[PDB]
Design a protein around this motif. Structure first.
Motif, PDB file in Angstrom:
ATOM      1  N   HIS A 172       0.619  -1.493  -0.048  1.00 19.37           N
ATOM      2  CA  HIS A 172      -0.242   0.459   0.427  1.00 19.37           C
ATOM      3  C   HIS A 172       0.953   1.508  -0.067  1.00 19.37           C
ATOM      4  O   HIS A 172       0.921   2.017  -0.770  1.00 19.37           O
ATOM      5  N   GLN A 179       2.109   2.310  -3.195  1.00 20.07           N
ATOM      6  CA  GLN A 179       1.467   3.463  -3.967  1.00 20.07           C
ATOM      7  C   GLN A 179       0.361   4.554  -3.905  1.00 20.07           C
ATOM      8  O   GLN A 179       0.120   5.264  -4.787  1.00 20.07           O
ATOM      9  N   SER A 180       0.981   4.682  -2.434  1.00 19.75           N
ATOM     10  CA  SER A 180      -0.329   5.852  -1.997  1.00 19.75           C
ATOM     11  C   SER A 180       0.404   6.268  -0.930  1.00 19.75           C
ATOM     12  O   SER A 180       1.392   6.601  -0.446  1.00 19.75           O
ATOM     13  N   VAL A 181       0.008   7.343  -0.455  1.00 19.79           N
ATOM     14  CA  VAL A 181       0.393   8.483   0.426  1.00 19.79           C
ATOM     15  C   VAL A 181      -1.448   8.594   1.624  1.00 19.79           C
ATOM     16  O   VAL A 181      -1.020   8.921   3.043  1.00 19.79           O
ATOM     17  N   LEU A 182      -2.188   8.110   0.685  1.00 19.85           N
ATOM     18  CA  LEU A 182      -3.549   7.798   2.121  1.00 19.85           C
ATOM     19  C   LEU A 182      -3.180   6.359   2.786  1.00 19.85           C
ATOM     20  O   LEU A 182      -2.756   5.967   2.572  1.00 19.85           O
ATOM     21  N   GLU A 193     -11.700  10.921  -6.705  1.00 18.67           N
ATOM     22  CA  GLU A 193     -11.054  10.345  -6.963  1.00 18.67           C
ATOM     23  C   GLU A 193     -12.521   9.514  -8.217  1.00 18.67           C
ATOM     24  O   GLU A 193     -12.324   9.227  -8.466  1.00 18.67           O
ATOM     25  N   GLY A 242       4.346  12.686  -4.506  1.00 20.77           N
ATOM     26  CA  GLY A 242       3.702  11.468  -4.418  1.00 20.77           C
ATOM     27  C   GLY A 242       4.069  10.249  -3.921  1.00 20.77           C
ATOM     28  O   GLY A 242       6.161  10.360  -4.305  1.00 20.77           O
ATOM     29  N   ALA A 243       3.485   9.038  -3.601  1.00 21.50           N
ATOM     30  CA  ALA A 243       4.692   7.839  -3.089  1.00 21.50           C
ATOM     31  C   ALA A 243       4.895   7.097  -4.996  1.00 21.50           C
ATOM     32  O   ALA A 243       6.038   6.472  -4.388  1.00 21.50           O
ATOM     33  N   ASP A 269      -2.951  15.601   1.106  1.00 22.50           N
ATOM     34  CA  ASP A 269      -3.038  14.130   0.885  1.00 22.50           C
ATOM     35  C   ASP A 269      -3.824  13.409  -0.546  1.00 22.50           C
ATOM     36  O   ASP A 269      -3.402  13.035  -1.273  1.00 22.50           O
ATOM     37  N   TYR A 270      -5.237  13.708  -0.276  1.00 17.89           N
ATOM     38  CA  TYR A 270      -6.164  13.012  -1.235  1.00 17.89           C
ATOM     39  C   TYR A 270      -5.901  13.987  -2.049  1.00 17.89           C
ATOM     40  O   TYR A 270      -6.231  13.098  -3.262  1.00 17.89           O
ATOM     41  N   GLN A 288      -2.985  12.330  -3.800  1.00 21.42           N
ATOM     42  CA  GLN A 288      -3.313  10.679  -4.469  1.00 21.42           C
ATOM     43  C   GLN A 288      -4.101  11.035  -5.055  1.00 21.42           C
ATOM     44  O   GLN A 288      -4.009   9.759  -6.758  1.00 21.42           O
ATOM     45  N   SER A 289      -5.507  11.719  -5.487  1.00 23.12           N
ATOM     46  CA  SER A 289      -6.449  11.746  -7.072  1.00 23.12           C
ATOM     47  C   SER A 289      -5.827  12.436  -7.903  1.00 23.12           C
ATOM     48  O   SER A 289      -5.489  11.928  -9.248  1.00 23.12           O
TER      49      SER A 289
END
Ligand SMILES: N#Cc1ccccc1C(=O)Oc1c(Br)cc(Br)cc1CNC(=O)c1ccccc1[N+](=O)[O-]
Ligand SMILES: N#Cc1ccccc1C(=O)Oc1c(Br)cc(Br)cc1CNC(=O)c1ccccc1[N+](=O)[O-]
Lengths: 162, 164
Positions: A72, A75-78, B7, B116-117, B152-153, B156-157
């Protein structure tokens, strides 16, 4: 939050982070950080009070390859909450059971992605009678945690890299 | 659950409208979300969203304000927000940047760095209308925990919308 920067050494920084988490209501935490382009979780910069035997078992059993929170984070920052739904594979069920045996059942993992490409996680566990209760506690402190994880990343990476 | 509509959005127009609405509800009437993919340095072809006046966005690029804007170097080094504050030993250019930003209605605000990731580099910049710095800091501090979640939302989106 500014107390994290002013700390001297890893032990004091860890003590500050743990107490911040503890005062917030999370009895167990793990802060882990890797440099850019590394997947060697075994040898991450790790801070926290997870049971030592569990930390050792996790490394030995290769759970970094299995733990749903690890993939996870890539793939994500959440945040990802430790809900039954995240343990989808039979091996992840095994992971859940072993983590549960260490007293780590309720909680969440906040992915960390640093300005310099550092990859990490702040995982926090909460003691609870049930899931619903644990979820309400976590919801009640989530905005505070969301700030905490970034303050921890910024200071934590500072400690580990400079 | 409000963050989930970011999203659910299909296309930049839809996404921009939702982000702006969420930001406006928090007292930020002007926002810029800017995002660069992994290892890209050119701020021009960046994925940029929001309602900053178009003339100001054009001028910022033209005048080369990115090398004078303190939030830019901050974002490359930190994940923590930076409140907009002039250095007060400032060059004509640094003075002009703030003066022209102010003239554009962007005097008070903050920038949230975005990392970002998948190595994305960006910023969410948000302005608040205020009479003075005390009022402005009050307005920003009071929504900071919500904004911390929002950035952060949005990251991600936004990254998915932009690159995926
Ligand atoms: N560095 C880094 C890092 C980078 C990205 C993602 C993750 C980590 C991380 O620290 O991962 C670990 C490790 Br290295 C050891 C242990 Br022990 C636990 C975790 C992360 N996982 C959890 O804390 C966890 C998540 C869900 C349920 C139970 C646990 N747990 O008890 O370990
Ligand atoms: N992508 C990216 C990006 C990546 C890292 C840092 C920053 C940005 C960014 O978007 O920077 C801009 C740009 Br590209 C145009 C404009 Br127009 C404004 C900013 C960021 N700066 C501000 O919003 C700002 C900061 C302080 C005072 C005034 C302003 N302003 O009114 O523009």
């Amino acid at each position: 939050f500014l107390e994290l920067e002013r700390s001297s050494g890893k032990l004091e920084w860890s003590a500050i982070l743990q107490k911040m988490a503890s005062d917030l209501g999370f009895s167990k935490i793990l802060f882990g950080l890797l440099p850019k382009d590394s997947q060697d979780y075994e040898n991450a910069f790790i801070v926290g009070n997870y049971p030592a035997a569990w930390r050792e078992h996790y490394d030995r059993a290769g759970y970094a390859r299995v733990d749903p929170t690890v993939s996870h984070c890539t793939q994500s920052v959440l945040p990802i909450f430790w809900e039954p739904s995240i343990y989808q594979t039979r091996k992840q069920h095994e992971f859940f059971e072993e983590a549960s045996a260490a007293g780590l059942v309720y909680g969440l993992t906040m992915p960390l992605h640093g300005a310099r490409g550092e990859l990490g996680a702040l995982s926090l566990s909460v003691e609870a009678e049930n899931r619903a209760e644990a979820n309400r506690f976590m919801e009640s402190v989530l905005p505070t945690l969301w700030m905490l994880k970034d303050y921890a990343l910024q200071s934590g990476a500072g400690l580990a890299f400079e």
